[PDB]
RNA sequence: CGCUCAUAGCGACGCUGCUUUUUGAUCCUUCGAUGUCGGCUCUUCUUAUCAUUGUGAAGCAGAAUUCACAAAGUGUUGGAUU
RNA sequence: CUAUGACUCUCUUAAGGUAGCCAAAUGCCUCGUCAUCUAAUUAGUGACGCGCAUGAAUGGAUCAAUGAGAUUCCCACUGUC
RNA sequence: AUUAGCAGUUUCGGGGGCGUAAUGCUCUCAGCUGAUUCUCAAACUCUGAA
């Protein structure tokens, strides 16, 4: 799932961390944390984490949030990777700290996206682009 | 009026507090479609009447 | 502890409910005494179904 | 269970057309009462010589 | 090897033990978890088909065979045919997982089938709703134990059904035979306690008072009315619990 | 078989063990019924005979035999009327197969009930044959023959080894051909006993047909 | 069995096989000692091909499956529990 | 027997597991059942407990303080990966 | 050890139309007995292997 990239996949993979990394929910829904289970499309090989997306969809969970949203897996969307990258451009976007949002399995983000969102992510997921006034 | 007379099913709901919920819904179902067994009990209120 | 069935007779034992008691008390003409004897009422009810 | 010692067959005495009763008969505005048969005092005194 | 010796323990455990504790001595048989069960509930296949070993041990695990003499002492028989059969029929089996599951299911069915008498009808009846009883059993989080009998479990579950909440149910029709003038008094007394219908008043004849009493505390109830009355009398019953009357909230 | 795949009971070996006053756990054979069709039908009314015969000495199982019979059972409406049908097998599984069981089936090593005292409980009942002994026979009228051979054909698959089908020149279950088995009726010196025949007794009997006449009725 | 229809797809009762990836039977080699089990690591290998490619079937309209062949060239994962 | 077995009756080898406690470091069946803890738990912990084969100075039950003690769970400075 | 029909029967077993149930007629079953056939037996053999 979902899947819709992009055109392209907005080029190479970069992560803040793979499996077992907290990033904030950045969402009006009362998920307060997002912890990764795994990432979609990772086919992977012998001993290698299923590694965080640059703006791609993930199997996640609400570890600390609303108890209703707590437990039960959730497809999400990575929004900003603390750990850095170069783009086809020659810039190195880098962030304060990791972040994403909990989302629908057609990609759609629920409420409104908080804070700054890398443009690649927006490009990937049109709903994301729609539901924010910050796309930097 | 019914195209084919009498199509029914004696279903039952799930979880204890939502037993009258079904009944309540069937009051709204009446509004929607002309036939449902909510008014006048012949086969009990947990039964559909359709064509 | 009955030698035989009845209704006409009694030993202050068993049951046998009828329409006579609720309508207008004792039964005369059609029988000497009202039915308060023979197999008890519940049993009677059961047995009809069975046969 | 006394009558099931004769053994009604699984196809012909339990048809798919003849299962309209386990989950197709909970219908009562008027009537659908089925009582448990036989009554004779207690569970020890019901049948002793019988 | 060196110092490093492939032991891998005595002989593999991989079959149903059937532990029979006769003459204070354990005798056991190589069978299978399912096969024994099958045998003991009707499916009488062959004696050495249900038994992977048609002989008797004293410790199936440790690989020890019993003395003929012991058998003779215990069972009064030498031939392994009879002894084996006995062991199969009346010794402690090890069920599988499948068998365990089946047992559990059976228990579940018989704490809704026994509770079908005291069933959970919705707002109106719709009198049976046995499916809904079954459903309700695990919605409360109940230990459907296969150790205890069904009846006991039924008793337990109704108490919980009270704190579901949807009230305890257990009503029948007690037809009390009451002679002389104290019958009337008794009737008067018990009218607030339980329901009174199909009544009659007689000084020279018995009174057929039909009440709607508790069924799962019925005997006790019966005991404490006669005493109140003073004189000895007869109070007939149905079976245990019946769904002739109302079982919606009652 | 059930405990075995019939590959260890393919070939004749060891002397005959049977359902005896020495064995006793011996199971009942898989068929105790050996005829199929009109057994009332006469020796004379049916004059057509086909056999089934092995070419190699092999131990046919009772189950196998049963299976074989219930081809020819079902090839009967396909044939055309059970009325025009006889069968008799003519090989009864008298002999019994031994099975020392391997107590280990999911694990556990004997060397104690291993191969010591390792003598079979009888399980398996079976019939021996040779290089031409009959294993099915069919009496019938001369209508069905391509039908019966097809039934046999089915039967052939249900049996181990290379079989063979021969049409006897007899009238089916009789020691006379047809050239002979008209002369008996024609000359009228036959004597009948239902499904069998008898024949009058001159070189059959002599000391008891010396001063006798009741022996020409 | 499969609406129909034995073999599209299965296939009862029955028979013939392969296999040495189960375990037993065995005790030929080693008790003047081959370092026992597992997991990490890593190559190579076999096909009884899961994907892949090229194909043939179907009860294959499509998507989705199911069955067969050629074919081992390349791929065949991250955890929780033990 | 609605029944966990209070209670009665009997048999041996005298007594017949009381109060407690438990799939415990004690429970084979066994990954016991129900519950929680987890995205997922043969792990832990609460409960249940006709307990293979628990149990009262063979000492039973609990528990502050302590422990290079055994187990788990969470925060815990992220080259173990 | 063990299969198959056939024959004489059975008021000596049982049930049908007739007849006293019938075992009498006309059908099937049960048992006995007589004539034949199937297959056969390491711990069987009338017979017999250099």
From Swiss-Prot, chain A:
The lineage of its organism: Eukaryota, Amoebozoa, Evosea, Eumycetozoa, Dictyostelia. GO terms for biological process: translation. It comes from Dictyostelium discoideum. CDD domains: Ribosomal_uL14. Keywords: Ribonucleoprotein, Ribosomal protein. The gene is rpl23. Pfam families: Ribosomal_L14 (PF00238). InterPro entries: Ribosomal_uL14, Ribosomal_uL14_sf. This is Large ribosomal subunit protein uL14. One of its GO terms (molecular function) is structural constituent of ribosome. The keyword Aminoacyl-tRNA synthetase does not apply. Belongs to the universal ribosomal protein uL14 family. One of its GO terms (cellular component) is extracellular matrix. Disulfide bonds: none annotated. Gene3D superfamilies: Ribosomal protein L14.
UniProtKB/Swiss-Prot annotation, chain C:
It comes from the Eukaryota. Expressed at low levels in brain. Expression is highly increased in glioma tissues. Residues 3-13 have a biased composition (Polar residues). Belongs to the TRAFAC class translation factor GTPase superfamily. Classic translation factor GTPase family. Associates with the 60S ribosomal subunit. Found in a complex consisting of the 60S ribosomal subunit, SBDS and EFL1. Interacts with SBDS and binds to GTP and GDP; the interaction with SBDS decreases EFL1 affinity for GDP and facilitates GDP release. GTPase involved in the biogenesis of the 60S ribosomal subunit and translational activation of ribosomes. Together with SBDS, triggers the GTP-dependent release of EIF6 from 60S pre-ribosomes in the cytoplasm, thereby activating ribosomes for translation competence by allowing 80S ribosome assembly and facilitating EIF6 recycling to the nucleus, where it is required for 60S rRNA processing and nuclear export. This is Elongation factor-like GTPase 1. It comes from Homo sapiens. The gene is EFL1.
From Swiss-Prot, chain E:
One of its GO terms (molecular function) is microtubule binding. One of its GO terms (biological process) is mitotic spindle organization. Changing residue 87 to S: In SDS1; uncertain significance. Keywords: Acetylation, Cytoplasm, Cytoskeleton, Disease variant, Nucleus, Ribosome biogenesis. It is linked to Shwachman-Diamond syndrome 1: A form of Shwachman-Diamond syndrome, a disorder characterized by hematopoietic abnormalities, exocrine pancreatic dysfunction, and skeletal dysplasia. Intermittent or chronic neutropenia is the most common hematological manifestation, followed by anemia and thrombocytopenia. Some patients progress to bone marrow failure, myelodysplastic syndrome and malignant transformation, with acute myelogenous leukemia being the most common. Exocrine pancreatic dysfunction is generally the first presenting symptom in infancy. Associates with the 60S ribosomal subunit. Interacts with NPM1, RPA1 and PRKDC. May interact with NIP7. Found in a complex consisting of the 60S ribosomal subunit, SBDS and EFL1. Interacts with EFL1. Interacts with CLN3. This is Ribosome maturation protein SBDS. The gene is SBDS.
UniProtKB/Swiss-Prot annotation, chain F:
GO terms for cellular component: cytosolic large ribosomal subunit; lipid droplet. Gene3D superfamilies: 3.30.60.300, Ribosomal protein L10e/L16. Keywords: Ribonucleoprotein, Ribosomal protein. Pfam families: Ribosomal_L16 (PF00252). GO terms for molecular function: structural constituent of ribosome. One of its GO terms (biological process) is translation. InterPro entries: Ribosomal_uL16, Ribosomal_uL16_CS_euk_arc, Ribosomal_uL16_dom, Ribosomal_uL16_euk_arch, Ribosomal_uL16_sf. It comes from the Eukaryota. The keyword Glycosyltransferase does not apply. Belongs to the universal ribosomal protein uL16 family. Component of the small ribosomal subunit. Mature ribosomes consist of a small (40S) and a large (60S) subunit. The 40S subunit contains about 33 different proteins and 1 molecule of RNA (18S). The 60S subunit contains about 49 different proteins and 3 molecules of RNA (25S, 5.8S and 5S). This is Large ribosomal subunit protein uL16. It comes from Dictyostelium discoideum (Social amoeba). The lineage of its organism: Eukaryota, Amoebozoa, Evosea, Eumycetozoa, Dictyostelia.
